[PDB]
Enzyme design. Structure first.
Site, mmCIF file in Angstrom:
data_model
loop_
_atom_site.group_PDB
_atom_site.id
_atom_site.type_symbol
_atom_site.label_atom_id
_atom_site.label_comp_id
_atom_site.label_asym_id
_atom_site.label_seq_id
_atom_site.Cartn_x
_atom_site.Cartn_y
_atom_site.Cartn_z
ATOM 1 C CE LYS C 179 -1.600 2.887 2.110
ATOM 2 N NZ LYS C 179 -1.681 4.365 2.010
ATOM 3 N N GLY C 236 6.326 5.642 9.023
ATOM 4 C CA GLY C 236 5.353 6.663 9.321
ATOM 5 C C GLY C 236 5.488 7.240 10.715
ATOM 6 C CB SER C 237 3.187 9.434 12.566
ATOM 7 O OG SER C 237 1.956 8.709 12.597
ATOM 8 C CB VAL C 240 0.336 5.537 12.341
ATOM 9 C CG1 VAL C 240 -0.031 4.352 11.461
ATOM 10 C CG2 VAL C 240 -0.549 6.724 12.020
ATOM 11 N N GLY C 241 2.433 4.081 14.325
ATOM 12 C CA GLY C 241 3.285 2.942 14.598
ATOM 13 C C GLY C 241 2.837 2.172 15.831
ATOM 14 C CD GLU C 258 12.922 1.806 9.675
ATOM 15 O OE1 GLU C 258 13.642 2.440 10.469
ATOM 16 O OE2 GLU C 258 13.014 0.571 9.500
ATOM 17 C CB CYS C 292 12.756 9.250 9.278
ATOM 18 S SG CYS C 292 13.338 8.655 7.657
#
Ligand SMILES: [Cl-]
Ligand SMILES: [Cl-]
Ligand SMILES: [Cl-]
Ligand SMILES: [Cl-]
Ligand SMILES: [Cl-]
Ligand SMILES: [Cl-]
Ligand SMILES: [Cl-]
Ligand SMILES: [Cl-]
Lengths: 504, 505, 505, 504
Positions: C179, C236-237, C240-241, C258, C292
């Site tokens: 995705k 991502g953030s 969300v992680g 990451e 990042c």
């Protein structure tokens, strides 16, 4: 000139990246048809080799201190160029050494695979960080290039086996002097030029052509005594290996030594006969039996001896032989050189003398002694009848390496005894067993004294990313493919950093 | 007998686990005080070595096929026994080779560390599983024992350096013939007995005593030509190494060769002088300069030359020298043997001849030529004045290894030139730089041609779990401690299994 | 359609190797100039993701049992195809995410390097042969594919960072559902097609486009609960992680995470100011601070604080900003998406509120609020003034990650305190120190709690063949490049073979 | 107090190296004979655990920055102390969890082996030096300690399995909070004291006793949400594992999860029946079937089904059962705890309900339901009849883990089908096949979805220096012994040093 099947090429040595026509002219004739002249090329006198070594020493300063990943980029380009040239090199290799086109495309492929493998090792070459026992202190290791490498190669695998040596050598930041087999000088000149096109700086690779004993190859070894080489790799006979070993020895060099063998292939009573026959057959007659790893003795388990022997001879009878340029369908062609033809002709007389039973084979194929499945004209070159013996262990046919299309059968009883007989040879390179009982393959696996072993598989066709090499008279302990070859072309630098202000 | 500082012990070779008195008796005298006789012991004739090799060949069958983790159990017991015996081995090693008690406890410790390291490698020795390019086919590699190993060792590290060879050899399933230095035969006999007590089966380790040239050591090399050894390890002189190299060469053996060196120690202008002086000082005079790795040349950066030299000599003046059995506080004691004392005495005359400036050192310490910080009686043994030269590069004092308490100073300018001068030596074992500029330590790190390098640390005192070894005339590329030594005592067996029942090529 | 700077492309999902137009159309506008429409493409409904996972399950049977070296041949072809396409992918990536052409060629290059690295690992993937403690018994280990991998990626590194996940996944024999960021759907479609051309069998890679929360990305995580994924990787953030972590948690998956950071860059008194300024500058403004690893806080040693600050602002003044398609010379361009622009605009008001001193930066670049070194039209997209603060530790500007061209200065005294302040952040991804004292670089090296550290080098520009990853809130312990990533996409099968025909225990 | 077979010991938590009697008293009774009381000990309330975590955080500063080789020296002393105590710990472990003395000496041995292994890793923990692509630049990696580790352990391997976690954790420089099974609190207190004697600094190891759900174990997990743990390891049920997984998940921890299994053992037609029966038998009834790795289903190849089944029952009939303190000769003894006895009693009713055929086993051994080869008094504790079923695949007896002396037989035809049936289980821990055909062992080896596989060997008795762990519902991908566990207790620090004065 144009020759009979292509151009006759004349060319010189490559030293610091220039062509050098300096020395008496030699020439390499098409072994399949000796009217075709493939190449004309000089004999490097010893002082020219001395110069080549010193261009290599000058070039090492810059190349060694070139980032390893950037050295990888050169190999990556070589992978691409080799891919492009694979059909050309295949043609040329059938012309220059008489390999069948299937086997010759395979040879080129192993160089392609080797080059890809090491392109990527540019970003590996891992060393270690290690914990100190002391506070405020760090420990490291680093793989470092040795310096100038001298390389001598045979001609039976004229692109593959040189690449096992040349590629990891330049990747780890070494510089090279290469003396290639007078049996395959055109392929070597080419391969050196492909490297140039791939981006190898001049002087990093130098090539000097000539012969072995009393010629360039010998001069080349002798220069270890003037300390011009920090490393030496050789593929060839055990006699020569021992000598090179000694010279490298007194000059504190670990040399790399692939020295051929007498490769046992065992067929146990529970084996799949058709599969084991195909594997004995291919072990024996691939490249006309001119491989370090070609099978020397089939050890057949007493219960199946007679049945195996009948089927094996049926299969051998079927072998095709001929000019592989004109008849690609052929199993094998001519002898690579005159020297192997000669040793192989003598093996018949040693056989008769010690009382081996000759089951099949009438020596050299000629008009006056024709071979039923020959294709072409057998007088245009040196071709050999497929040859099969029964032999007692202990004998010379059993123990001594004989390049050429010859194989022995031997009756064994135990697995016990199969292993004892398999080991009764000065060599210890390659080996194979055909069996289905897990216990039988286990006992052979760990009872054999060899550096490579095949279960239900031929003694030939080692995969290029596994450690290639022999124990006993087959070599001195080094290995040639994969991560294992990195021990050969580097040394271990050990560093300790103190960040305290204390002695400890 | 009773000796002067302990018993005089008589003992034989150990072959297939029995004592063997076979050959002319030698004797090892206490080098610190040669009135004390430490031991009497035979010189193995070449045929007895031949027998020792063949007991080792008989024993290899069952030892090699002994589970590697069980071989580790033997080593684990040895760690415990060595621990128990650490004070006695320390005493005996001061008696038999004249090491100071601190240095000798350290020697014993490295064997302990080595044995622990390899006890655990019994459950490692990892090989590889590898993917085939063909379907229905698996690939493997396996580390395999070479066979019978012949081992010759020096006497200056009589427990440590043998253990670097002995332990990884038996752990990887090899069997051993060991010829130890006639300078340290009692420790070797002991250490072989500790191994026995630890559970090493008889014949796996055999010990044959004697000398080097024209003696057992030579017979021992010559037997590679009869194929009684599948591997050989040696610590000693480059002269001898080259010969051993050649013999192993023609017999297709990679031998292991620690061959000493001329170990450059660089002091850059930005260094911490007191720390760099302590490191030059300890590099020079540790074990009385009788280490493979003892410093040969201090290269001092021109800006600090004079200041460094003055402080270094002040520090050298302070060196204590003496019978380390009677004066533990002493920095170094006697020469291990008369060979080293002799070569070192000659080095003074080579020095005068090529015009080195002798800054400090009056040759052999005697009553008639006493040393201000000597403790004890200097005639009871061979003891040496600490010795300091200034030398031009290119000279023989600069290029040749000289066991003994001698060090050279050299003026250098660049980092450029420090590195060029550091490399102007046939050897390439150990090295050191004292500096604080990150770039300067980096350039030396990658500019030196040595197999070991110290930043703000001495040329001596390698850690035991890092690869020990030299490049150039210092060795042939092998390495001795840690995981790196496994390459020495094993070979790579490569196996391919086809399950697909067809020839695919 | 024709767009303003190229074609507007419409395309569907790729499932078992077919195009699938299934769901409401989204659109990706050229962020540099939003009049240019780059693509229209569907939002995968959760049932289509379910189907993609099950095509991947069907395909895994034959791909996993495809020889690893042959899987490498696919990657080797991909290296060649990527090489051929490097100029087109560079153009498209400047169009679709607004990276400068230099940075975008670099992105493509890391995929090329990654693919070459793993082409070769087809003939490695080494496992172990291990010695049994029992006679007549062998032990092995084998790396085995996990199964179907679900992958979600950001859009700021739209070819590189996907390749860190995609390539090692398929090489170790896994199958994939991917995705990609709705910020870079055209590049992903392409890259999936390049893979196809390289010889990847259909269904081994499936691509489903869409958004994150309340869209495909969320549906995609939720499917771990139906066991359609045996592994999951996400960039991502941290918000969300943590959620993805939890879902993978209860489904016994180690996911790869990451999660960005607040990357401390320390400048010690003894540093080279010009070099440390170039490194702070490039750390801050590379990709417009949308990495990042972009620097969050410069910690400047009190003695050089004022001098550094003056030179840094001089250097920041010089930053060029603009439409990188029309002005390649520009340092950075627009925000990738409107979410980042929004969070970054708010950061000014959080700053004012907690009392940070704003040294430079006037918020969004517009015609009414122009930027002296802007090139092009700043209203065509979301562009940001370079922004510099001074901040107390403990504040939210100091602790919270803010994608965008913003950096903080902080005054520090010790190395002591530099390290303590560097660590006062929930994140632990990247770090840097500029210094020349060996001891100071050592103390930071071992005092920092980060998974990557640079000495006299930026917080950005990790080399692709070193392990990429963060500790603390920056990730859960996995690593992404080199040999280290093999732990992520494989499991350890341990095999023991008895040949001795008896129970021994 | 003195108890019936030894002393009753009362003791507290160990926090920063002090004893702490703080909480309601629990007690552990001898499961073999519940009149014997082995120990009395507090329930750590959640705030005490909070304190233990914070002593661990304070201790980490000094321990982590203690040289790794010196940390090894602590383990080396532990090896010696454990050796000395091996007879004592063996006695205590038979008393506290009812393992037979042979099996219990084995347990202690694995801790000894683990300790030796990691004593030596103090001088390994290798990281990497890597080549930069840039000139004048070096790259490194370094393994770094995570921080404070929370550890929860079961009681069925009360010294071994804790040591797999405790030892590599402290060796790599982490600090620990340990919550041991209320089934084995005395051994844990001891083992923590042996560590103290070996030289472990106080606070590096802290021990907090109590229960699981609604007790200390749960409080302990909940503290991951306050970020007091940088790592968590758990051995236990899949239900609990999934929960712990989730909590660790949202707190960005990779947890280590050994979660039991339903371990397939296949017996092919060509197998050695006596050997395969001994291996099924030992897989089933070792530790009374209370092992993560105990066999759940024997898959017998149709041709030999009847013959195998007759011989297996003969062998099972022979199993001895009893108080292993009074009858060392006994195969297995009591249930470790009440919970497993209960689940195992229910399994009989699920069996009858879904229609499994019960071949042997009459549930709990009592006076009123005696067992022919029982030794001692079966009412002094919870003992189970050996139990054997035939079952269809798909059923709950087939798919669900059941701690206790129960095993199922299943008829299979193919190797094809043996592999498909072996995999029809949510778990994927351990597995075994008994066969002699190389091809059959190969297909199972690579067709099974398990993290451990035995050829002609039991599903139990993994060697301590191989990676222990399961795939599927048996765990989340981590591994526990050997070099493989280093991924669990460390993270990778990547360092790049620039020595030029250039940006690149
Ligand atoms: Cl030749
Ligand atoms: Cl020859
Ligand atoms: Cl010839
Ligand atoms: Cl015969
Ligand atoms: Cl419990
Ligand atoms: Cl439970
Ligand atoms: Cl309970
Ligand atoms: Cl049934």
């Amino acid at each position: 000139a144009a020759g009979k099947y292509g151009n006759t090429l004349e060319f010189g040595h490559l030293v610091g990246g220039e062509e050098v026509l300096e020395g008496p002219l030699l020439e390499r004739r098409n072994p399949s048809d000796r009217e075709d002249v493939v190449a004309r090329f000089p004999e490097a006198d010893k002082d020219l080799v001395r110069k080549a070594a010193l261009k290599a020493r000058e070039a090492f300063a810059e190349w060694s201190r070139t980032p390893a990943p950037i050295r990888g980029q050169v190999l990556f380009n070589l992978v691409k160029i080799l891919e492009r040239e694979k059909p050309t090199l295949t043609r040329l290799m059938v012309r220059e050494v008489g390999k069948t086109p299937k086997e010759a495309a395979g040879d080129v492929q192993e160089a392609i695979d080797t080059a890809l493998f090491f392109a990527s090792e540019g970003r590996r070459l891992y060393g270690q960080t290690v914990p100190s026992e002391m506070r405020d202190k760090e420990l490291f290791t680093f793989r470092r290039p040795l310096g100038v490498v001298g390389i001598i190669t045979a001609g039976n695998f004229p692109i593959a086996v040189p690449s096992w040596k040349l590629i990891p050598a330049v990747l780890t930041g070494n510089t090279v002097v290469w003396k290639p087999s007078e049996d395959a000088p055109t392929l070597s000149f080419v391969f050196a030029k492909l490297f140039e096109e791939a981006g190898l700086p001049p002087g990093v690779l130098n090539v000097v052509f000539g012969g072995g004993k009393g010629s360039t190859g010998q001069w080349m070894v002798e220069l270890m005594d003037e300390g011009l080489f920090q490393k030496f790799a050789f593929t060839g006979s055990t006699q020569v290996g021992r000598w090179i070993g000694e010279v490298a020895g007194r000059n504190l060099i670990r040399p790399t030594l692939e020295l051929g063998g007498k490769n046992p292939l065992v067929v146990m009573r529970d084996a799949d006969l058709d599969l084991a026959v195909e594997g004995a057959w291919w072990s024996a007659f691939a490249t006309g039996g001119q491989r370090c790893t070609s099978a020397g003795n089939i050890l057949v388990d007493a219960p199946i001896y007679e049945e195996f022997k009948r089927r094996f001879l049926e299969r051998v009878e079927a072998t095709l032989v001929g000019n592989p340029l004109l008849h690609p369908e052929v199993t094998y062609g001519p002898f690579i050189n005159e020297r192997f033809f000669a040793r192989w002709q003598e093996h018949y007389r040693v056989g008769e003398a010690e009382g081996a039973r000759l089951l099949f084979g009438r020596g050299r194929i000629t008009r006056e002694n024709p071979y039923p499945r020959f294709l072409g004209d057998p007088e245009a070159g040196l071709y050999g009848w497929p040859t099969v013996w029964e032999v007692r262990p202990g004998t010379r046919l059993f123990t001594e390496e004989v390049f050429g299309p010859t194989i022995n059968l031997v009756k064994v009883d135990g697995i016990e005894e199969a292993i004892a007989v398999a080991n009764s040879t000065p060599y210890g390179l390659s080996s194979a067993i055909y069996t289905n009982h897990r216990h039988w393959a286990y006992l052979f696996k760990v009872g054999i004294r060899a550096g490579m072993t095949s279960i239900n598989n031929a003694t030939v066709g080692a995969e290029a990313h596994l450690p290639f090499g022999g124990v006993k008279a087959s070599g001195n302990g080094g290995r040639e493919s994969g991560i294992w070859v990195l021990e050969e072309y580097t040394y271990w630098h050990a560093v300790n950093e103190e960040y305290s202000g204390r002695l400890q």
